[PDB]
Amino acid sequence: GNYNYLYRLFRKSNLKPFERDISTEIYQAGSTPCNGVEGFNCYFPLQSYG
Amino acid sequence: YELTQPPSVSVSPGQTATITCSGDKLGDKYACWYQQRPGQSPVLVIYQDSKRPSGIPERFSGSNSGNTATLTIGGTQAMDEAAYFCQAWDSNTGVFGGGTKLTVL
Amino acid sequence: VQLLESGGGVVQPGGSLRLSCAASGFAFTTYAMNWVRQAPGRGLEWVSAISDGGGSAYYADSVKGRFTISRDNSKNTLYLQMNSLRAEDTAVYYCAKTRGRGLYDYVWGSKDYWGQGTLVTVSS
Amino acid sequence: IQLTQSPSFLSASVGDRVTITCRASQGISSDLAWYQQKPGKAPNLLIYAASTLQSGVPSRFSGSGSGTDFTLTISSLQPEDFATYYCQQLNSDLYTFGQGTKLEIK
Amino acid sequence: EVQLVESGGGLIQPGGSLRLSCAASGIIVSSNYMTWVRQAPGKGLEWVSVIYSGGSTFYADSVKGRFTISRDKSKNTLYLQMSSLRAEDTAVYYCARDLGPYGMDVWGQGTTVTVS
Amino acid sequence: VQLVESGGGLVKPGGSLRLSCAASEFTFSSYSMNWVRQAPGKGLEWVSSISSSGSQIYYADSVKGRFTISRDNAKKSLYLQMNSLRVEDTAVYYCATNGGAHSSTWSFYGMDVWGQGTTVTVSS
Amino acid sequence: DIVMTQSPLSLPVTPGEPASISCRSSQSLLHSNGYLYLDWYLQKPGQSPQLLIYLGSNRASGVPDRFSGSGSGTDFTLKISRVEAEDVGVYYCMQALQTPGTFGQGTRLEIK
Numbered sequence: 001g002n003y004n005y006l007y008r009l010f011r012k013s014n015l016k017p018f019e020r021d022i023s024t025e026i027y028q029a030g031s032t033p034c035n036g037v038e039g040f041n042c043y044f045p046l047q048s049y050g
Numbered sequence: 051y052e053l054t055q056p057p058s059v060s061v062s063p064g065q066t067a068t069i070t071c072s073g074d075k076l077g078d079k080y081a082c083w084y085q086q087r088p089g090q091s092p093v094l095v096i097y098q099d100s101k102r103p104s105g106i107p108e109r110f111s112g113s114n115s116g117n118t119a120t121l122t123i124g125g126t127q128a129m130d131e132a133a134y135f136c137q138a139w140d141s142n143t144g145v146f147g148g149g150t151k152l153t154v155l
Numbered sequence: 156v157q158l159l160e161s162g163g164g165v166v167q168p169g170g171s172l173r174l175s176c177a178a179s180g181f182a183f184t185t186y187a188m189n190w191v192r193q194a195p196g197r198g199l200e201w202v203s204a205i206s207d208g209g210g211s212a213y214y215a216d217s218v219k220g221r222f223t224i225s226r227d228n229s230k231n232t233l234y235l236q237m238n239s240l241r242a243e244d245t246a247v248y249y250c251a252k253t254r255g256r257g258l259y260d261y262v263w264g265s266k267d268y269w270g271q272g273t274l275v276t277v278s279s
Numbered sequence: 280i281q282l283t284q285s286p287s288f289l290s291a292s293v294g295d296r297v298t299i300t301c302r303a304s305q306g307i308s309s310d311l312a313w314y315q316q317k318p319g320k321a322p323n324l325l326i327y328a329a330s331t332l333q334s335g336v337p338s339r340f341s342g343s344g345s346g347t348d349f350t351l352t353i354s355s356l357q358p359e360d361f362a363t364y365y366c367q368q369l370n371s372d373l374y375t376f377g378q379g380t381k382l383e384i385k
Numbered sequence: 386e387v388q389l390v391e392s393g394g395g396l397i398q399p400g401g402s403l404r405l406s407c408a409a410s411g412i413i414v415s416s417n418y419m420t421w422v423r424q425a426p427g428k429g430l431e432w433v434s435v436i437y438s439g440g441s442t443f444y445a446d447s448v449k450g451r452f453t454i455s456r457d458k459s460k461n462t463l464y465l466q467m468s469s470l471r472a473e474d475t476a477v478y479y480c481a482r483d484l485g486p487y488g489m490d491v492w493g494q495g496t497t498v499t500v501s
Numbered sequence: 502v503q504l505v506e507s508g509g510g511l512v513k514p515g516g517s518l519r520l521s522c523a524a525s526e527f528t529f530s531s532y533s534m535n536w537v538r539q540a541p542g543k544g545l546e547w548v549s550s551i552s553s554s555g556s557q558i559y560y561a562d563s564v565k566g567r568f569t570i571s572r573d574n575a576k577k578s579l580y581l582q583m584n585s586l587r588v589e590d591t592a593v594y595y596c597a598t599n600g601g602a603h604s605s606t607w608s609f610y611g612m613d614v615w616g617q618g619t620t621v622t623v624s625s
Numbered sequence: 626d627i628v629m630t631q632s633p634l635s636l637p638v639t640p641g642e643p644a645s646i647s648c649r650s651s652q653s654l655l656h657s658n659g660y661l662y663l664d665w666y667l668q669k670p671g672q673s674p675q676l677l678i679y680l681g682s683n684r685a686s687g688v689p690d691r692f693s694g695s696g697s698g699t700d701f702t703l704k705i706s707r708v709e710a711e712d713v714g715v716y717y718c719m720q721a722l723q724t725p726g727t728f729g730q731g732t733r734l735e736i737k
Binding site for chain 1: 387411412413416417438439440441482484485486487
Binding site: 331332334337338 | 686690
């Protein structure tokens, strides 16, 4: 797996024509508060390509 | 880079004081001097090795040549009893001298 | 996920060495890394950690200046600079990745996956 | 893409080592999810990313394979370990499943 | 804790109209990938639709032109507009939450839809 | 300008602080700031420095990787992130303006306007 | 520095019995954001550790259900529901709050 290239799958906002996301936040997947901690309903925007 | 100042020197009131500052090829650089009276934030008294800031009496005379930076205080009075820090800039690095304490009797 | 640690062996008291943590099976591009040592029968003790893209070079006192770390974000490898090695660093060295990839998941904190470890012996 | 499980009807007694195979026709190498479905019930994740244990799944369930080959391995069967087992294409557009393998506590 | 509950299916004449509902507790529907999944009697699971967290929609080849997926942010609920119903639409449908590399982590109980 | 600092308090080694140095006027924008700490028993140490625009940031050798100087000319404030507060960081810190717009002109000036220092203490 | 002490130094416990391991921090490890930054590790004999308990009370992927953590502020306890023959080895705690990362000294759960 070449895990050098990634893709922001985890994001709620749709992007505007030519927009570049580069943030490293904890994607909240629901109402469960993430509070800067990775886990259930708390994943990460980027998804490494296999 | 280090600047070497004698730990302390003293003269009687009304005399002329002389405090030295040593550095490697220090006469090629700009040196600032500051006055720290005990319990007080320091005040700039000499910069650019020859010029005297606004608000300072002319008896604060400083000069630089070779490897020594010197400050001269003619007619020293009571409140010249203070810590004196020779300052210099080298490669964007603020490096302070040892700090010579001047004592008046 | 594999954490292959390379290098290591018998080095001279005061000599030099450099260690390689070749990682695979995961991103490593947004993950922090840790270096953990264990002298023989003396317990896991910390050494180092790095951020996602280097720059953040975090060291213990005993490795102040004497050790430095780096990563090859293109080739997905972790490195470890050594100088003037003393006898207290004779140990097996683990490179370990942080859990995770967000902030407040401290780059010097939880260590999810560990390697197999290589022995670094300082003697003559 | 076409996913094929092999074979459909499978039987073993308690304690046997089982290897349920979902074979990827093209080769995707990380996109598998193992779906166990009690007869007439709601499926559940077993192994996601084809090798990692999804949280709360008991440690008797394992997955292996990468690329074109993929397998489900159960180290020690239980009398309740009978179900219909699905494989799914992750990171896809149609989320293609397999036909389904019905393990039987026989 | 994370529960999906479904309603709206039932016996409906061929070609008729219908709608499903899927209330969600815990998960916000308006920011997660929700999918519709079908299971015909005597058959396995099969995909129907997905509506993206941004609001983009998707349906299967056997679904395009017939069904529509719809949502509500006020009630945190998922809907499926059911229309032009043929005999092959007789199945049980569940609502699941899509996380890409992570599998369908939560599921619904399912509702039986019959065509006659 | 007229300078006032804040933020110094009792913390234990390794803790976090965030000092400040607020300005009275908006002439703050024209001054390159310096952080200078004064030991309880010795004189002064240069800690860091920042340009008028804030794009020319330098640190002392003993403090890089720990502190993070930043400013806000529209907020007329100067900050100093204070992480891994460590055994010899107990001191009184002075915020002093240089006047020179960029690091290339710092040698032509001196630190003229000092605010009242803020006492920082680290101890167990 | 955060110097952490484990309690006790050894816990030889027969398999099938329950076991608790306690390690108390010198300082407070609570609420960097609202959690307890103490992590629990098991170094099984001859091989490398992996996480058992993170954030004081929670566990990582794939951990046996018998493990659980408890305690707040300075006192923290690991709770093994049923010791077995694969549980042998040293247990470590770590403070995950300040940069100097210190581990425990190592208490083995063994079979006596």
